[PDB]
Write a protein that binds this DNA or RNA. Sequence first.
DNA 1: GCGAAAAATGTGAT
DNA 2: CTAGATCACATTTTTCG
DNA 3: GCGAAAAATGTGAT
DNA 4: CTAGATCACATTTTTCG
Lengths: 201, 198
Amino acid sequence: PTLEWFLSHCHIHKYPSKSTLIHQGEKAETLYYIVKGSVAVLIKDEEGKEMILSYLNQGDFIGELGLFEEGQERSAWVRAKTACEVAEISYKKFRQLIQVNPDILMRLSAQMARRLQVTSEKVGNLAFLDVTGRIAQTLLNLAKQPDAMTHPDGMQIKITRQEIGQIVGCSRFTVGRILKMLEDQNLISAHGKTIVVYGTR
Amino acid sequence: PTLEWFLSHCHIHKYPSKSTLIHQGEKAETLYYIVKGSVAVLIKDEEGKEMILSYLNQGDFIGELGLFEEGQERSAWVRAKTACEVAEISYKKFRQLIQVNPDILMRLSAQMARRLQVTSEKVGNLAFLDVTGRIAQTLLNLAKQPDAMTHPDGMQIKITRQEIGQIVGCSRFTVGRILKMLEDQNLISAHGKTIVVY
DNA sequence: GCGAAAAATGTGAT
DNA sequence: CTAGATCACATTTTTCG
DNA sequence: GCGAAAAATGTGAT
DNA sequence: CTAGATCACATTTTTCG
Ligand SMILES: Nc1ncnc2c1ncn2[C@@H]1O[C@@H]2COP(=O)(O)O[C@H]2[C@H]1O
Ligand SMILES: Nc1ncnc2c1ncn2[C@@H]1O[C@@H]2COP(=O)(O)O[C@H]2[C@H]1O
């Protein structure tokens, strides 16, 4: 579409697993674009604990936040969850594709619109729903987005308790017991893969 | 220029000191613009308590997140914080607007970006910081927004314990003593009008 | 600028 | 009053060559 | 079908 | 091991007409 026009002005790079693509801080001047692969977008505290503040996937743009204002620091980290093919353009160039065909600035904005929405829920269920709650709708969203083996009938994602814990913002230790005694209610399953939607005990 | 152009095309309405300007649950119709005043995006707890996610003042944008797909159920209530003068246009009558001019595709999108930046922060401060902490940062932010009135020392900011508890996410009892602690440590005063000696 | 009616809020032990 | 954190060390899963 | 390093777990009383 | 929360009606500070 239009997106193959913008995509052609873009050096196509592969990254390894666990590479960093962006650090919080770094000069913001390149607007990326995931061609293949998935990506976790974090933030971290000077003391150390981090948070997962979204996943992103094919056709998701990255580094979008700089572009509207000049010279600002990258707002979060992003580390390839797995091997990605990411493209890239300078902002100085991007804004040109824009004033040469304005549909891509549509493509882009709708991205951060769903994003402003999903994020405002995330604030909402940190001030409201306790761990068990926060944990619950999480495994839920973790099947409306790819890796959910319909164990035959019913999801089976893999994500480690430590990870869930890093989505929710609760100790790895709490994410153990709650997830555990969550199968007590016959609602869940275990090992590393969580087979959601049914469960057992 | 656009902010006076599109401003021509729109339709100015006054809303009093408290009208519930937009409502969650609902349907993405008009795209609004604060011609005068400020606003209080607040979402709602399971049943009951609000949490302010933002304020948006003179010249910010409301209900844009409707714009780029369709049938989108409105995202959070937006209640005026005072007599703010909303100048409404139209989604349908925005797209047309948007191709005789990309400049305001831009500005709306710039606001969109600024907001996901500070929203990302909230998600960070709620999980990376203790309550007194969120209370300290907040008074810092509010003293750094327009209604704040410069004072001989610091910035004062007419607000109330119930509302910091809100914005923060903690019992108004707990906003109660923290404010009296930092009171004693000279970092802040109160009387409804808390002066942030900072 | 006014005061009645309305909204803010603080005690602590668990 | 009550949920969630924190602690060490061995225990398990899980990795991949 | 491999098999020990590695990364992930669970105690449990406070 | 501890961080906030909490539930009443007296006094205070704030509203709007
Ligand atoms: N709230 C968010 N949700 C998801 N992704 C985000 C969020 N905030 C930032 N990002 C992404 O992570 C990137 C980190 O640096 P940037 O500010 O360029 O761009 C950011 C976005 O692309
Ligand atoms: N996180 C946020 N920060 C600021 N404003 C927001 C946020 N979430 C929603 N809004 C505003 O509140 C409105 C809710 O419904 P809309 O989707 O019409 O458009 C929304 C935004 O303009």
